[PDB]
């Protein structure tokens, strides 16, 4: 072990799960809050919050690959294809909704929206009459379209592009009944931790329906997003630093899953491939995951990003604050050592 980090066992077709688990483990401000969940009275076999605490504790302390069977048992994804029937966004939503729920009424309540919540304005503007509706919309990740988009800038541009409402899809303007309108979204705020879902898996019907888009899609190490804000802050530009690149090798149906991280936000990347963690180049983490072409029409080649984590540069120091063995409550420590004391009588 030259990296100082430990891997996660392969225990079935859990797909994106181990990549997610590493990505959240290294969201240090999240990890510390997770350690603070009051799990002492939890049922050791039904608690997703406890199982997540246990995986984090072992990731932080173990020298051997960390198992997850208690985790998959706790949120009930235990059949042969349970993870194949979902995606990384539903897993993460479920996990983090579970931990935030366990945080209610505690000092660490509101951690999840603090780290992940951003605000948009969704607006509908009538063309031939004077009505505009402006509403705030909260989001916790961003799904970016990648088909026909060459880079992340083009994806964000498409995301805030104006949609027309006319003909068979006209707008209910109430008192001025049906009106031709323009529908759009602008960003008000962007969160400290920015999860970008790259929409390579696109459910193309009807009705086969499984597909995966392997086209080239570039993303940068430094992502400036000020130009997509309704209003910019001179003291806090929306500059984001790439933290994690979650990678899939293959096409639809079958594939291999890896995550690249620079856990400290310092540009020193590692590759996390289940139980194997090793240092890699910045080029392996970034440019080599853009996807590409070798043969004609397709090959494919075939190892590209489907999710990215960026951290706001001004928030990097806080999100990635150090975690020590002293940040783990003794109640949790003793419970896990007792568990490891029950598992070692085999």
Ligand X SMILES: CCc1c(-c2ccc(C(=O)NC)nc2)cnc(N)c1-c1ccc(O)cc1
Strands 222-224 vs 276-279: parallel, antiparallel or unpaired: unpaired
Rounded distance, CA 246 to CA 24, Å? 12
Binding window for ligand X (CB under 6 A); candidates: 110-118, 156-164, 207-215, 247-255: 110-118
Query: Given the complex with ligand X, which of 51 and 92 has the nearer CB atom?
Result: 92
Cα distances (Å, whole numbers) of residue 273 to 85, 234, 260, 278, 287: 22, 40, 9, 9, 18
Query: Given the complex with ligand X, which of 65 and 263 has the nearer CB atom?
Result: 263
Please confirm, yes or no, whether 256 is among the known catalytic residues: yes
3-class secondary structure, 318: helix
Catalytic residue among 107, 126, 176, 256: 256
Q: Is residue 96 near ligand X by the rule CB under 6 A?
A: yes
Q: Is residue 320 near ligand X by the rule CB under 6 A?
A: no
**CB 243, CB 262: distance < 8 Å:** yes
* Residues of this chain, 186-215, that bind ligand X according to CB under 6 A: 195
Tokens coding 74: 């706790």
Tokens coding 303: 């190892």
Alpha-carbon dihedral angle through residues 205, 209, 214, 216, given to the nearest 10 degrees? 20
Tokens coding 292: 């590409």
* Residues of this chain, 116-155, that bind ligand X according to CB under 6 A: 116, 140-141
Query: Given the complex with ligand X, which of 92 and 181 has the nearer CB atom?
Result: 92
Q: Is residue 89 near ligand X by the rule CB under 6 A?
A: yes
Least separation in angstroms between residue 9's CB and ligand X is 22
Of 97, 128, 137, 334, which one interacts with ligand X (CB under 6 A)? 97
Strand partners, 138: 119
Instruction: Number of residues interacting with ligand X: please give it, by CB under 6 A.
Output: 13
* Active site members: 15, 256
Binding site for ligand X (CB under 6 A): 89, 92-93, 96-97, 100-101, 112-113, 116, 140-141, 195
């Amino acid at each position: 072990k030259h990296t100082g980090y430990v891997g996660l066992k392969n225990q079935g077709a859990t797909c994106y799960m181990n990549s997610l688990l590493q990505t959240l483990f290294f969201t240090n401000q999240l990890r510390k809050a997770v350690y603070m969940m009051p799990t002492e009275g939890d049922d050791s076999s039904k608690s997703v919050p406890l199982a997540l605490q246990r995986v984090f504790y072992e990731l932080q302390h173990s020298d051997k690959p960390v198992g997850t069977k208690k985790l998959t048992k706790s949120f009930g994804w235990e059949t042969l294809d349970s993870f194949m029937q979902h995606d990384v966004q539903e897993l993460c939503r479920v996990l983090l909704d579970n931990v935030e729920n366990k945080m209610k009424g505690t000092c660490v309540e509101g951690t999840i929206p603090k780290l992940f919540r951003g605000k948009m304005v969704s607006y509908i503007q009538c063309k031939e009459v004077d009505y505009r509706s402006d509403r705030r919309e909260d989001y916790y990740d961003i799904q970016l379209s990648i088909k026909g988009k060459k880079n992340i800038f083009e994806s964000f541009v498409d995301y805030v592009a104006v949609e027309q409402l006319d003909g068979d899809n006209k707008y209910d303007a109430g008192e001025h009944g049906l009106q031709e309108a323009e529908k759009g979204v602008k960003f008000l705020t962007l969160p400290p931790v920015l999860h970008l879902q790259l929409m390579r898996f696109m459910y193309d019907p009807q009705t086969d329906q499984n597909i995966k888009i392997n086209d080239r899609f570039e993303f940068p190490e430094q992502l400036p997003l000020d130009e997509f804000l309704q209003k910019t802050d001179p003291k806090d530009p929306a500059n984001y630093i790439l933290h994690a690149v979650l990678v899939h090798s293959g096409d639809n149906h079958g594939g291999h899953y890896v995550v690249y991280l620079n856990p400290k936000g310092d540009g020193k990347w590692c590759k996390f491939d289940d139980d194997v963690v090793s240092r890699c180049t910045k080029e392996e983490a970034i440019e080599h995951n853009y996807g590409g072409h070798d043969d004609d029409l397709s090959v494919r080649h075939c190892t590209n990003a489907y999710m990215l984590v960026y951290i706001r540069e001004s928030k990097l120091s806080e999100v990635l604050q150090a975690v020590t063995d002293h940040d783990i409550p003794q109640q949790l420590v003793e419970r896990l050592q007792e568990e490891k004391r029950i598992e070692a009588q085999k």
